[PDB]
Amino acid sequence: IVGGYTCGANTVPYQVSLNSGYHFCGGSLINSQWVVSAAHCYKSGIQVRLGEDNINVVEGNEQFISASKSIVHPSYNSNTLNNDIMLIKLKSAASLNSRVASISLPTSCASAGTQCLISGWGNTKSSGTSYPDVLKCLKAPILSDSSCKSAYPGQITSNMFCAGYLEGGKDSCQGDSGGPVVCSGKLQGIVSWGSGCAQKNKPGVYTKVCNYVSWIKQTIASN
Numbered sequence: 001i002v003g004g005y006t007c008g009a010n011t012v013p014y015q016v017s018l019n020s021g022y023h024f025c026g027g028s029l030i031n032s033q034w035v036v037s038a039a040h041c042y043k044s045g046i047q048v049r050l051g052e053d054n055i056n057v058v059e060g061n062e063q064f065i066s067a068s069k070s071i072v073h074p075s076y077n078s079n080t081l082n083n084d085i086m087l088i089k090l091k092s093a094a095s096l097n098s099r100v101a102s103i104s105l106p107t108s109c110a111s112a113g114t115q116c117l118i119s120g121w122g123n124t125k126s127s128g129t130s131y132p133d134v135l136k137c138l139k140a141p142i143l144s145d146s147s148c149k150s151a152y153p154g155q156i157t158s159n160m161f162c163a164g165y166l167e168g169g170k171d172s173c174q175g176d177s178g179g180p181v182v183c184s185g186k187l188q189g190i191v192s193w194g195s196g197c198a199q200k201n202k203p204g205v206y207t208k209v210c211n212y213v214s215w216i217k218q219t220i221a222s223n
């Protein structure tokens with residue numbers, strides 16, 4: 001997260017870290033058994049880490065739970081990142097509490113101009129590399145579709161939206177991948193892609209979660 005601030009420990013209790021010997025992606029807890037992340041985060045051997053603040057220090061509120069299965073969206077296209085969403089099931093149910101909590105799925109999509117919260121443990125520099133060990137947060141508005149498409153011609157689909165700042169300086173970044181964009185108490189986006197981080201006229205691009213609620217509810221009820 002570039003140009004953000006320290007969230008404060010467990011203030012974003014639905015945020016998870018996916019670990020395979022190291023943190024490599026964010027995710028969002030949607031109920032005691034299931035995590036939503038980006039399809040480009042897929043790998044086997046995932047451990048889900050809940051209740052984290054400092055991902056390098058055991059602070060006392062963590063739950064570490066192996067994934068039992070992953071389900072990548074049936075139409076995910078790695079080349080275009082269209083339908084960049086996956087579900088991950090926990091081998092055992094998380095114990096929900098005030099530091100380990102689910103985020104609600106939307107009942108409808110958000111509007112352009114709605115303010116959101118984007119969070120993660122990714123790089124905090126727009127030139128160079130620095131990874132924080134505590135969770136970082138960013139307030140960012142949903143941008144118009146026309147500013148999004150103008151920034152990235154021929155590359156935005158109906159399953160994507162832009163959020164952030166066209167002047168730059170504030171953005172998500174590598175390592176934030178798969179994490180939440182929460183707007184008005186709902187998970188509306190997943191950190192997906194962009195050009196560099198915090199660059200002028202290159203805002204972040206997010207998976208448009210409202211398009212997938214039916215798929216999500218049908219898939220978890222059948223697995």
Ligand SMILES: N=C(N)c1ccc(CNC(=O)[C@@H]2CCCN2C(=O)CNC2CCCCC2)cc1
Nearest residue numbers: 040079080081172173174192193194196197204
């Ligand atoms: N908000 C940001 N600036 C931002 C930028 C990048 C990332 C991390 N995501 C990524 O790097 C993702 C996954 C691997 C390929 N990838 C890409 O961004 C690769 N370029 C894309 C262009 C559009 C068509 C699909 C490919 C996460 C956030």
Ligand SMILES: [Ca+2]
Nearest residue numbers: 054057058059
């Ligand atoms: Ca920790």
